Amino acid sequence: YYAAVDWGTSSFRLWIIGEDGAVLAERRSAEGMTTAAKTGFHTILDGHLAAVSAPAHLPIIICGMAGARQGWKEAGYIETPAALAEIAGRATAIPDVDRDIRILPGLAQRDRRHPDVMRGEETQLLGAAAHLGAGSHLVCMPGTHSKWVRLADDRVEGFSTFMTGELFDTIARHTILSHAVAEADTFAAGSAAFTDAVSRTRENPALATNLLFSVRAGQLLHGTAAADARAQLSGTLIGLEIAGALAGSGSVDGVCLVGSGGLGTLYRTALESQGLNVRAVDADEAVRAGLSAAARAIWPL
Amino acid sequence: YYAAVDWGTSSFRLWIIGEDGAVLAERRSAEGMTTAAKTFHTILDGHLAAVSAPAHLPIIICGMAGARQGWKEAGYIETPAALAEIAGRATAIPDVDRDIRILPGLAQRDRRHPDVMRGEETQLLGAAAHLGAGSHLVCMPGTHSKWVRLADDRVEGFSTFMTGELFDTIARHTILSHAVAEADTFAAGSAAFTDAVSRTRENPALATNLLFSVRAGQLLHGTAAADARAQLSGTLIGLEIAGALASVDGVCLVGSGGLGTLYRTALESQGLNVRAVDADEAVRAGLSAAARAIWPLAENLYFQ
Numbered sequence: 001y002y003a004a005v006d007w008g009t010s011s012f013r014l015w016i017i018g019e020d021g022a023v024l025a026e027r028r029s030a031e032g033m034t035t036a037a038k039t040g041f042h043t044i045l046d047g048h049l050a051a052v053s054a055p056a057h058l059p060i061i062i063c064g065m066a067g068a069r070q071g072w073k074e075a076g077y078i079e080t081p082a083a084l085a086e087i088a089g090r091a092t093a094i095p096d097v098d099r100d101i102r103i104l105p106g107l108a109q110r111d112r113r114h115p116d117v118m119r120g121e122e123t124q125l126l127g128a129a130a131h132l133g134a135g136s137h138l139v140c141m142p143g144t145h146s147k148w149v150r151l152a153d154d155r156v157e158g159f160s161t162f163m164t165g166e167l168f169d170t171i172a173r174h175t176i177l178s179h180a181v182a183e184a185d186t187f188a189a190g191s192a193a194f195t196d197a198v199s200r201t202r203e204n205p206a207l208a209t210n211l212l213f214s215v216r217a218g219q220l221l222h223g224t225a226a227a228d229a230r231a232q233l234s235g236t237l238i239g240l241e242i243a244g245a246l247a248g249s250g251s252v253d254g255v256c257l258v259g260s261g262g263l264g265t266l267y268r269t270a271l272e273s274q275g276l277n278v279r280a281v282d283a284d285e286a287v288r289a290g291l292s293a294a295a296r297a298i299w300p301l
Numbered sequence: 302y303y304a305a306v307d308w309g310t311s312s313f314r315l316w317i318i319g320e321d322g323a324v325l326a327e328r329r330s331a332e333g334m335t336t337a338a339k340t341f342h343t344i345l346d347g348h349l350a351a352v353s354a355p356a357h358l359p360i361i362i363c364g365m366a367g368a369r370q371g372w373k374e375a376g377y378i379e380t381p382a383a384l385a386e387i388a389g390r391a392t393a394i395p396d397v398d399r400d401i402r403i404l405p406g407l408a409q410r411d412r413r414h415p416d417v418m419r420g421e422e423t424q425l426l427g428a429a430a431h432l433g434a435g436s437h438l439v440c441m442p443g444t445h446s447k448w449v450r451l452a453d454d455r456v457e458g459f460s461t462f463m464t465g466e467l468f469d470t471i472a473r474h475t476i477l478s479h480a481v482a483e484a485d486t487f488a489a490g491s492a493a494f495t496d497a498v499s500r501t502r503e504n505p506a507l508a509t510n511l512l513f514s515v516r517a518g519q520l521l522h523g524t525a526a527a528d529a530r531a532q533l534s535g536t537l538i539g540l541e542i543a544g545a546l547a548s549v550d551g552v553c554l555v556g557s558g559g560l561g562t563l564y565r566t567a568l569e570s571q572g573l574n575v576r577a578v579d580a581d582e583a584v585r586a587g588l589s590a591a592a593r594a595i596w597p598l599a600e601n602l603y604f605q
Contacts, residue, residue, distance in 0.1 A: 108521060115517040132434040145513065166475050174470040175463070190580075193303075206505035206543035213461040214444065217415040221408055243506040 004291035007066035025052040033065035039073035059100040063123035067103040078106030088294035127289030184226035193228035197235025205243040305588035308366035334365035357402040364420035377408035388591035427587030480519040484526035493528035497535020
């Protein structure tokens, strides 16, 4: 019996978990990191606990941006390489309250040639890894920042962020490419526009910023439909991510994909188009499971 | 004789020219094609009034004044294209008081590799003779950086890389604004810059990871804003060259000022010779060869 919270930058999810593992209650809102920093983390939380009649001494495990510098209380990082089990033990307690409330830290790769950082995904990893062996895994965690993580023996060995989602959104809205992709809201992951682009760039990463301009040139000279231009932009950026993810990885078979929604489908299509097997793990199921593994290790029954 | 106008996306430049060949006056500002579609004559009349231009001095204009989202759509001549075709394909802007033309751009129509250039073809009209003869490879940096295979007053093909526009939007609208924002500049020579260019030119695949690292670098160690900016610029540029190079010794850079330095710096570090050429000297020249061609002047039969 604990609450578990995924505190994101623009949203908030909470689950009350009973003694037997079952979800007894669930709450979900827009009060993410940026709202809570104006109006108060503790108050937003006390709101949801009251709304579902939590006991006053129900303990609470949190992951994500509630633990960033701009959040409720800095949770910091654990340096990789690091056993997945270190996470729960290095959680930060909220100091002047009558409830055990703890926030899990991010992971940091301090290497000077490859500095890298994650906050949130580590907890999804904790939930995902329970479904896999203790053997070797290359794990893809897509988003505004896709994380590619090397798991072995239940340790995170290292990881690489690729800013593909953030790049997509800036290129689509703030550059000339917006005149080619604005008219379209969606595209079909299954379309050739998409997987052709993933292949052009995966095979020719060096040309990336020529290929991006080609989406605009293509439109001007040949009337590329907005949906296909959107796909093309999308595919280019994700194919370049894949190229980087695999740049001397030996042979890799062999990828586990932690994702959900249309995002998860886009990536799976992308990865499978480049000849990789995919093992899907549902991103939301994995946070809860990650948050539950930590709770069971800090408050054992 | 003529007004020459180079009307870019973000900048306006004018030169008044005499039958002698000399510049007589000049105007600069930052009203480019995007600002101009706010106000399309008025900007042109203002600068003309300013410099005391004859009311019927004709006007030759290259650049984005000729795009769809501009003054009037000029065309494109498709590649390979003889540079000498350009002036003949110019497009009038109706005016009873003056003969105003805009130069077309070039288009590479290949369905793989579609590509487009509006203005750099006039810097190439300008510079073809000077550069020399036979095959050249010319790099033309800017918001959109052009790489052009030139031979005998002929563009054979070319490649845009959108490195400048990427630098800007990445610097202003992504998380990296936190890493670079409160710097405005960085010294081309700084090792932060050529390291970025080299690790990226060597590992194109990792580009969008490398970009994230400037911010993770700033979070974990405390990178100085100029070194971050440099890393940023360097990464983008290293990537361009990787792509441009996808043996040449062996390149001719056309550019001016800050960015010109930055690229020679970046290009030499990758082991290339850089025969440089001033950017504005090549445009004024390209607009001159067009002007002489449609409004040839009355010669003195006894001279040459």
